[PDB]
Design a protein around this nucleic acid. Structure first.
Ligand SMILES: [Mg+2]
Ligand SMILES: [Mg+2]
Ligand SMILES: [Mg+2]
Lengths: 59, 63, 46, 40, 49, 59, 282
RNA sequence: UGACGGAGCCAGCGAGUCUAACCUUGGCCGAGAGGUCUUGGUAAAAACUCCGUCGUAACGAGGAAUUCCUAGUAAGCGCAAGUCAUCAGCUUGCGUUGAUUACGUCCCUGCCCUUCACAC
């Protein structure tokens, strides 16, 4: 993908300023708190993203 | 240069064709004349090759 | 030196070829087209 | 083989003489292509 | 296809990278080069903007 | 480019010759490199790759 | 200044875009003028255009040098700065001095550590009209670029067969009169463009008896530059070379100053197109 | 106004799925093509600051002549890119450190110009 130089990116007009989100390193508290339903919900959650993958490809 | 040119002509009525060196202790050549001779000699040689390209016979003069 | 001669020869040959091809096409269109248009008019007259 | 571009011209004595003849002719006829001051 | 034999319309097969050069990768053809040039010009166009 | 010629003397004969890649990128033999023998410098209409092969057509 | 220069360019660019659109309109008005004078019938598209015919009453009273030079052509003498690339060799410095003597209103400036944006911005403040930058290869001049301020054009040349005046023995000092100019074999529109660029480096109105002549002779896109001093004799003219000798071949022409690498290219040299060697553009 | 080592520390340019050696010793697999491993040789920021150690055939900073040069200039130092011409026997950029001397005169040497009040 295209990588704009930071010197150009710095002096850009307000309307056209590229939003580049930085990666997260320190573990957020909410990230440490969220519960992921395992077991049966994992299988019903892999199944859906398999179906939506077929549908996007077929289209 | 022109002042020398006017003086010479009124007495009578191109220094760029010579390459001149520095004397460490002078005209060195003739770039215009030397190149022309070197270019004409290979010009006639090229002419000879284009004459020789598609010939098989030839006058064999043994006199 | 050889490069200069080859380029000039090639350009001359190309210019001659293009003139020759144009002439044969133009002469055919003019002379044969005249006969074609002439005959077609006679067919219309009939 | 083919060559992509024509070589740079060589300044022979014949070339200089042809150039000099042009310059002498232009001066003799007193015709030059030079910028002219605009009126006002 | 008028006045053309099927022999004239024969497939000409595509040659491959030399084994001595197999390490460098796939021998690009004209179609492969077009993909590079088009992509580069698309990016350079936006950057100039 | 390398392996086209064996000595810098051969390159001098072919300077200015048209060359191209398998991709079809057209170029020219500009000058012979002093080191190593047979290598030479060329200019192409576009950037070429290491996997490319340059060919000089001769008869 | 910065804001003023910006809008002057936008207005100028907008004018060019409109003029290209208006070129069709100008031809249509020419047809109407010819039709009225000749009496020949007007074509169908123009016959049915009532707006154009109404406008023609106002536009009936309507009537060269390039637009960048038209404003000052023949009024204000040029101001020229001749510089080189960073850390120039001794010969390039000598050649830059020779180019300085060629143009009557030239000033040589040392390029020690000067960055390109500052050089043009400084030149624009001081009223400089042209900037000349010279390159070399092992003390042999190779390239010459001419940037016209405030908005271009920038023309880059490559120099061949350079013979400097310092290579001569006992040559003497030059004459620095405003020289006569000779521009021979410049026929195409690009040639007329090149002539205009080179013509305006010299002052307007040389004296008729001026004894210095500078000639630019086009021979297969290789422009030979010679400098002579002449004396009118009773049976002709005798000229003598002052030098330097060199041939420039144009290879780029951009609509902007030399700092702007993004300037729109007005003309470029295509060396790898199939029919490159067939035609000579200039 | 050195060499060696260590330590501290300061730039701006530059981002195409594109960037990149050569010649050998041998094992195995494979009909071949070739694949994989093994093996030896050849080639290929600096300045700056602080601390410690030593210590002062050819050539030892370049004759006569000749050339260039006025402020971020002369000079020193490194880092990048190679942009249709030119360039790698190199070219062009970028930053870093940064002065001495003149900024007057027409004496010499060249080039050039001249012969609407009031006051002169
Ligand atoms: Mg310096
Ligand atoms: Mg350096
Ligand atoms: Mg340099």
């Amino acid at each position: 993908g295209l990588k704009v130089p930071k010197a150009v990116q710095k002096e850009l007009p307000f309307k056209s300023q590229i939003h580049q989100m930085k990666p997260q390193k320190k573990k957020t508290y909410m990230a440490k708190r969220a519960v992921v339903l395992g077991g049966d919900e994992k299988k019903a959650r892999s199944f859906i993203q398999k179906v939506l993958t077929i549908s996007k490809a077929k289209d | 240069q022109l002042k020398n040119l006017k003086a010479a002509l009124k007495a009578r009525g191109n220094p760029f064709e010579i390459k001149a060196a520095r004397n460490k202790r002078i005209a060195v050549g003739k770039p215009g004349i030397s190149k022309q001779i070197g270019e004409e000699q290979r010009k006639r040689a090229f002419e000879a090759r284009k004459m020789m390209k598609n010939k098989r016979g030839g006058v064999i003069d043994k006199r | 030196f050889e490069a200069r001669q080859r380029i000039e020869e090639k350009n001359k040959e190309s210019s001659d070829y293009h003139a020759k091809m144009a002439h044969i096409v133009n002469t055919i269109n003019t002379e044969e087209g005249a006969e074609k248009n002439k005959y077609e008019r006679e067919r219309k007259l009939r | 083989f083919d060559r992509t571009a024509k070589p740079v011209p060589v300044i022979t004595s014949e070339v200089t003489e042809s150039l000099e003849d042009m310059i002498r002719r232009r001066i003799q006829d007193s015709n030059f292509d030079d910028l002219q001051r605009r009126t006002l | 296809a008028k006045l053309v034999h099927d022999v004239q319309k024969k497939q000409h097969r595509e040659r491959s990278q030399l084994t001595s050069r197999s390490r460098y990768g796939f021998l690009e053809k004209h179609k492969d080069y077009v993909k590079r040039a088009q992509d580069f010009h698309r990016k350079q166009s936006t950057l100039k903007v | 480019i390398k392996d086209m010629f064996s000595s810098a003397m051969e390159v001098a004969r072919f300077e200015g010759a048209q060359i191209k890649t398998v991709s079809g990128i057209r170029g020219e033999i500009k000058r012979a490199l002093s080191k190593p023998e047979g290598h030479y410098r060329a200019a192409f209409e576009d950037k070429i790759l290491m996997s490319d092969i340059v060919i000089l057509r001769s008869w | 200044m910065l804001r003023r220069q910006a809008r002057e360019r936008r207005e100028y660019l907008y004018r060019k875009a409109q003029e290209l659109q208006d070129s069709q309109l100008q031809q249509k008005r020419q047809i109407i003028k010819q039709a009225l004078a000749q009496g020949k019938p007007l074509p169908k598209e123009l016959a049915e255009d009532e707006s154009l015919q109404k406008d023609f009453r106002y536009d009936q009273s309507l009537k060269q040098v390039d637009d960048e030079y038209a404003a000052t052509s023949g009024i204000m003498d040029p101001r020229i700065i001749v510089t080189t690339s960073r850390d120039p060799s001794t010969r390039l410095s000598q050649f830059a001095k020779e180019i300085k003597l060629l143009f009557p209103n030239a000033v040589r400036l040392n390029r020690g550590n000067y960055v390109m944006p500052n050089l043009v911005d400084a030149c624009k403040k001081s009223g400089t009209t042209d900037l000349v930058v010279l390159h070399e290869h092992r003390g042999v001049p190779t390239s010459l670029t001419i940037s016209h301020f405030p908005h271009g054009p920038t023309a880059q040349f490559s120099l061949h067969n350079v013979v400097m005046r310092h290579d001569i023995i006992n040559a003497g000092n030059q004459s620095e009169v405003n020289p006569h100019l000779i521009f021979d074999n410049f026929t195409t529109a690009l040639g007329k463009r090149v002539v205009c660029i080179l013509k305006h480096l010299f002052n307007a109105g040389p004296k008729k008896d001026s004894e210095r002549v500078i000639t630019f002779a086009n021979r297969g896109d290789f422009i030979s530059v010679r400098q002579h001093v002449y004396v009118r004799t009773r049976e002709g003219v005798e000229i003598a070379e002052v030098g330097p000798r060199f041939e420039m071949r144009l290879f780029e022409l951009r609509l902007g100053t030399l700092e702007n690498k993004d300037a729109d290219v007005e003309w470029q040299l295509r060396r790898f197109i199939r029919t490159a060697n067939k035609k000579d553009y200039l």
